[PDB]
Amino acid sequence: MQNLSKMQSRLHPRPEGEGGGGGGRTKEKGKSLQETHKEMLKNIESTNI
Amino acid sequence: DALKVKKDRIQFMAVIEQLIQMVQNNSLTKFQSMTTLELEDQDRLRKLIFREKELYQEIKKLQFDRNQENKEYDNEQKDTNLKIQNLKERLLYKKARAQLKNQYKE
Amino acid sequence: QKVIMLKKLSTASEEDENHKAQLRDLEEKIEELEKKKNKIQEDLTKLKE
Numbered sequence: 001m002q003n004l005s006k007m008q009s010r011l012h013p014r015p016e017g018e019g020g021g022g023g024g025r026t027k028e029k030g031k032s033l034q035e036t037h038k039e040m041l042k043n044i045e046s047t048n049i
Numbered sequence: 050d051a052l053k054v055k056k057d058r059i060q061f062m063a064v065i066e067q068l069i070q071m072v073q074n075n076s077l078t079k080f081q082s083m084t085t086l087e088l089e090d091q092d093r094l095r096k097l098i099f100r101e102k103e104l105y106q107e108i109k110k111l112q113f114d115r116n117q118e119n120k121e122y123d124n125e126q127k128d129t130n131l132k133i134q135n136l137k138e139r140l141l142y143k144k145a146r147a148q149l150k151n152q153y154k155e
Numbered sequence: 156q157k158v159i160m161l162k163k164l165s166t167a168s169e170e171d172e173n174h175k176a177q178l179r180d181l182e183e184k185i186e187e188l189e190k191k192k193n194k195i196q197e198d199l200t201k202l203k204e
Binding site for chain 3: 050051052053054057061064084087088091093094097100101104105107108111112114115118119122
Binding site: 033036037040041043044046047 | 081084085088089091092093094095096
């Protein structure tokens with residue numbers, strides 16, 4: 001009886017409390033009036049000439 | 050054309066009065082939203098001409114590319130099929146020669 | 156507003172109705188050609204796969 005089976009273990013170590021992660025959600029720069037309307041102004045110009 | 054120009058003039062005067070009312074109410078956001086909505090609405094005209102020119106160019110080029118690429122795909126299919134069957138034939142011939150030589154040597 | 160009103164007044168009233176009558180057909184054919192190009196692109200992707 002020299003068996004050395006590889007049965008899985010059952011250690012207790014728990015996933016201790018999560019640290020203070022930096023939840024820095026980047027503030028998506030909403031395209032301002034000029035940035036928002038530049039494409040539409042270009043399209044309107046493409047027709048105005 | 051003159052009737053439409055006058056109607057546009059009336060629409061613009063109404064828009065100016067609406068802007069005046071908004072300013073008196075300090076509702077600049079509403080005015081900006083109205084301008085954005087009108088900009089989104091109007092969009093295009095006559096640009097459609099060269100738009101169709103470009104679309105025809107792109108469709109012709111991409112259909113030619115599709116036909117070409119189908120050509121290379123069929124080329125590879127037939128070439129690799131020929132390679133595989135020739136390899137199988139050579140393997141069978143080699144096996145037959147091996148068995149013949151083995152029997153002769155025994 | 157200036158650009159949109161230039162766009163409006165740079166168009167003939169007959170062309171204005173064109174936006175509804177004949178430019179309807181023009182824009183519908185533009186959409187048809189765009190979707191045809193989309194279909195050909197899908198065919199190219201599938202063929203490459």
